[PDB]
Design an enzyme around this catalytic site. Structure first.
Site: not given
Lengths: 292, 292, 292, 292
Positions: B45, B133, B161, B203
């Site tokens: 992001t 992640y 995550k 997140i």
């Protein structure tokens, strides 16, 4: 050029994980002797992911020098940032490579419009011929035929390595592009089928260790002798499949070593050494191909 | 801090694509005032893909400086080459970040054993907490619970995550790891479900523009008040979906601009500007959320 | 026989939902005049699902009588219970149909061994030629090439309607079966490709309303004139796709009515009348094919 | 009763494939003693696919008779033709069953509007409670939450057996329906997660052989004691998975036989006997569960 059996060549390494020149030269002599049409240097099979841009350029230039004008060399130039793709492409301008193989951005999942602007900017920053490259299972992104048609109108963008394994794409792309736009399979197991539908060749992992068979199969295919081509494909099919029994290029580097083509089968993390069960699986596939 | 609402913050840019310090400051002030638990700096992001490591590091250091001790900062440090992830990690050692968010290698598709070795090596060469992640739709590979279990035994690998949107993974992972291993959703639309099953936070992309609601929703969830957290989530659900109507972070940078939180919505290629239809769809989602 | 363009014919109904003889006769005369090679009676396009076994037999026999020896008729005989498949097959023994089209059991998801025993028992309870039929998206079950090879050794089992849309299956099946085993596409959009790979024809939904084009395309394809065949395919492609814009046979029955081939487009629940948006979509596809 | 552990009971058979009354009685006595909430008679685990409607009805009436008021009985009444589902439903009107379990039409792939009309019509022509049943992997179609919401407004459509294994559907459905609409998992391996998200019970295959554990686990779940329910679920998890190692109900009928709960493990084609490897895998799962 951009036709027949094109090898996605491994980057042979010493035990330290750096390019081994003697092994690379042995491979290039082998592809010259085998009738391989071209070499793709530092694509994914050549560990583009774990080489930095300097090391990657050193390997391309070394491959070019060692080829010594005997066999054309296409550079892998893919990147998921457009500015990095341009920059990497520019290292090879006026270098002697005949074209570039450039992947759809991986990880950031661009839109079709993003793909258009990405490849268009790259093409505008070079005189080198550009081969688009679509492999959704690696990238998370799928360059649809419609966008390929759009990009083919760029004078500089001249073909696609289509690695979906989805054969409907051959004729979907072909009806949208001009007759000299080149269609290359990027999936060894379906590549003969791909050619039978109007594809012009294959960028191949199998070719690393079965270069002569692969060159003969693609020539027979180009001449329309599909049944004679299948006899070779069937011989080669366990290899087509088992060379991905573990993540590419772990199997094909082990096979290269087993055939005495490279000195070591060393790779860079996160690629790990082939498992024992993987060895025996790849050995049987080489045996079936008549190479061991 | 590794629980609650953690924002995967945008990297705001001027019209030329360079980090805009004044917009970033405003975002950070907004997150401090809105009760956000922590900031993930330069994840996807934050356009990690299109910043070079120099700019990536600059943005993190700027985020740290602007945060001024008021909010913990986690740096994105993911890479598809293990040596490159280690190097990137080294740039942040005594920087002030509380931890690292490190993605499964993208594109090269390593095995489970390769993932183990990748993350173990990163963990070894730093004291910083590491959050694994997993996001298969971007990376082409999938870190399975079994491997998460092996890696949780490493002392500074402290959480994950999990962005599959597959909710069965919450308890498959939880039973294989110790009670203080942190499970964080990376999929806004299924995040409340994720926390209700045992997850500790998220997140989040939505938190960029609905930071107060996200913070309260995550607190209610941690207190076990799921019904009252769902009411907030129901208001936020169009945003959870429509922030990915076009590739992230295109919609969310536009939303940040529409709210006056950033000066421009500029991105770097291969991300392109939001379409008119996406403008309309995101605006209706913001109004459903009560933000416009 | 078992070659060229074979229509999966609709079961035209009056407003009460019962077979309309005058409409069925109009369709059969149309397929005789159009050069359609054979009719599949009461497959899924003929609403096999919502007809009981008596009604289904009445339609097959009516189709046979109306065909009056001018065009071969294959009966749909599929069932998910082996004993019901045998029983249904036996209604047509010594009837005049030339063969049976029998689907992999749907819903109960048999193993490959279950499929083998299912089709083998059916074949042993009849002298009729059997065409296997694989359509995983309807059935939840996938008859793999290896099992097709096994079943092809039954004297009675003579071909497959392959409706995966996965073109790799053509040559995977072909290398495992004898040269007179017939490969039929069951997916109109990929059927020409299927034939280009060595398929012998198509069991087609498009043929219901574009019978002449379809017969000409399959003849050109069988004679190796693939480029001339594609001109027709491209004309027919919006139909290939839009005839499934709503569940088959809702679109093709509406199109039949629009072309004056049937009196009503009535169907049995759970099939519902075409939507307005569906009408306009199918109308445009007929327009593009040159039929309206 | 429509909460808790509901067993999708096997239809035990003799060596010829006919219902075995004595084995069925033993199963029913077992479920009464073990605290099972209700029995689903002749769903897919009860071989609905391979019983004709006469035998299907006989088994239900026998189950009712043997249950003798001690345990509620829900009849499977699903069909892919709406008139056929209505007819089947009519056979059970004043039979003593408490409700019906009715699947989305399989094979013919109706639209959402077709599903609405299918289930509304069934509901209209009976007073019996109706439980919708979604299982896309068997049927080829997917009843989405939106449509479940429309159908919940019909007074005698009282719940859903949701067997996607997609856990996001629990709260997507729940927010669209009233508080007394019952949400039941049809996927044993994700069932505890399903209840923890708001689900009220499970229609279970595992309950055939672990009825006491399943009943206690579902009660703990309803009381909110998820941690203590997970301990039971952890013991049952190999069974949750390995009962589908070969097509259901092949493994579970074998398990029932191994435990002495039924005289034979015979099924009807296209189900075939369990393989030796499956024997071994299921036996180890039963031992993990503490049943052998």
């Amino acid at each position: 050029m951009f036709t027949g059996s094109i090898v996605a060549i491994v980057t042979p390494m010493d035990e330290k994980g750096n390019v081994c020149r003697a092994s690379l030269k042995k491979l290039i002599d082998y592809h010259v002797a085998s009738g391989t049409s071209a070499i793709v240097s530092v694509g994914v099979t050549g560990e583009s992911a774990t080489l930095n841009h300097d090391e990657h350029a050193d390997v391309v230039m070394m491959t070019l020098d060692l080829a010594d004008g005997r066999i054309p060399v296409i550079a892998g130039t893919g990147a998921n940032a457009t500015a990095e793709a341009i920059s990497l492409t520019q290292r090879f301008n006026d270098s002697g490579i005949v074209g570039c193989l450039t992947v759809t951005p991986y990880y950031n999942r661009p839109s079709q419009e993003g793909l258009y602007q990405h490849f268009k900017a790259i093409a505008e920053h070079t005189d080198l011929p550009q081969i688009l490259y679509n492999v959704p299972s690696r990238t998370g992104c799928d360059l649809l035929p419609e966008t390929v048609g759009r990009l083919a109108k760029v004078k500089n963008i001249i073909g696609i390595k289509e690695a979906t394994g989805n054969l409907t794409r051959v004729n979907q792309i072909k009806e949208l592009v001009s007759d000299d736009f080149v269609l290359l399979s990027g999936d060894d197991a379906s590549a003969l089928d791909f050619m039978q539908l109007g594809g012009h060749g294959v960028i191949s992992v199998t070719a690393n260790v079965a270069a002569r068979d692969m060159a003969q199969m693609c020539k027979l295919a180009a001449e329309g002798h599909f049944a004679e081509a299948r006899v070779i494909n069937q011989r080669l099919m366990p290899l087509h499949n088992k060379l991905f029994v573990e993540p590419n290029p772990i199997p094909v580097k082990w096979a290269c070593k087993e055939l005495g083509l490279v000195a070591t089968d060393t790779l860079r993390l996160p690629m790990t050494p082939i498992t024992d069960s993987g060895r025996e699986t790849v050995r049987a596939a080489l045996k079936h191909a008549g190479l061991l």
